[PDB]
Design a protein around this ligand. Sequence first.
Ligand SMILES: O=C1CCCCC/C=C/CCOC(=O)c2c(O)cc(O)c(Cl)c2C1
Length: 214
Amino acid sequence: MASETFEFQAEITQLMSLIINTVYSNKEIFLRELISNASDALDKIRYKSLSDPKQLETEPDLFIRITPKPEQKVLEIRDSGIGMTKAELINNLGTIAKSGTKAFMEALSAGADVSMIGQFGVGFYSLFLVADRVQVISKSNDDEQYIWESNAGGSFTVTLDEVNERIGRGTILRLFLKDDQLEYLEEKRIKEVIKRHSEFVAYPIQLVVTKEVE
Ligand SMILES: O=C1CCCCC/C=C/CCOC(=O)c2c(O)cc(O)c(Cl)c2C1
C-alpha cells in the first residue's frame, strides 16, 4: 500500500556510504556474509521449533536459495529462517541495530579487513559492495509479509507486501547489482564464491539456474 519512511540511525548511514563507495578489492565477501545470516536465521527457527513444532508448518523445508535474475540485474538470497515482522525489519535493519557498527568503522580507520565485518555483527551492509539498492522481503509467522527498501542513502521504506511471491516463512534479500558487478549473476562465478568461503553450512544451498532448452 502506502509506504512508511524512516531515518537510519546516523552511524548506519555512515557505514553504508563508506561501503557503497569503497574501492576495496574483494567484493565477493558479501555472499559469505549473507549466507551466514541466512544460516543463522534458519538456526533460530529450528531452535524455536524444538518446543513449538507448529512454527515449521508455514514452510517445512529449511534451505538457502540463490536466484540470479539477469534481465533485472538482480540477485536474490532467500532463506526459510525465522523471518522478521514489520517492527523487526525497522529494528534489525535501520533505526537501531547498534551493535558493533561504530567499532567496525573504527577497526576500518585502523586497517581491518573489510572481511571482518561479520565479527562485528553488521555483515548485512556488505551487500553495498555489489549493489546500489536492496529490498528485504520478509515473512515471520507473527506478521504479514513486508518489504524494507534502502538505497544506502539515509532513509528507508517499509511497505506491506502486495507485489512479491508469497514466502511461506523467511527472508529474501533482493540485491539490485551495480552495472560493474554483473559477474554475480553468473552460475560459474556464484558457484566458485559459495564453495570457497561457505563450506560448513548445515542447510542446503540451492542455486536456481535458468537455461534455454536446445
Ligand atoms: O537481523 C538480521 C540478521 C542478524 C544476524 C543473524 C541472526 C538472525 C536473526 C534472525 C532475523 O534475521 C533475518 O531473518 C535475516 C535473514 O534471514 C537474512 C539476512 O541477510 C538478514 Cl540481514 C536478516 C536480518
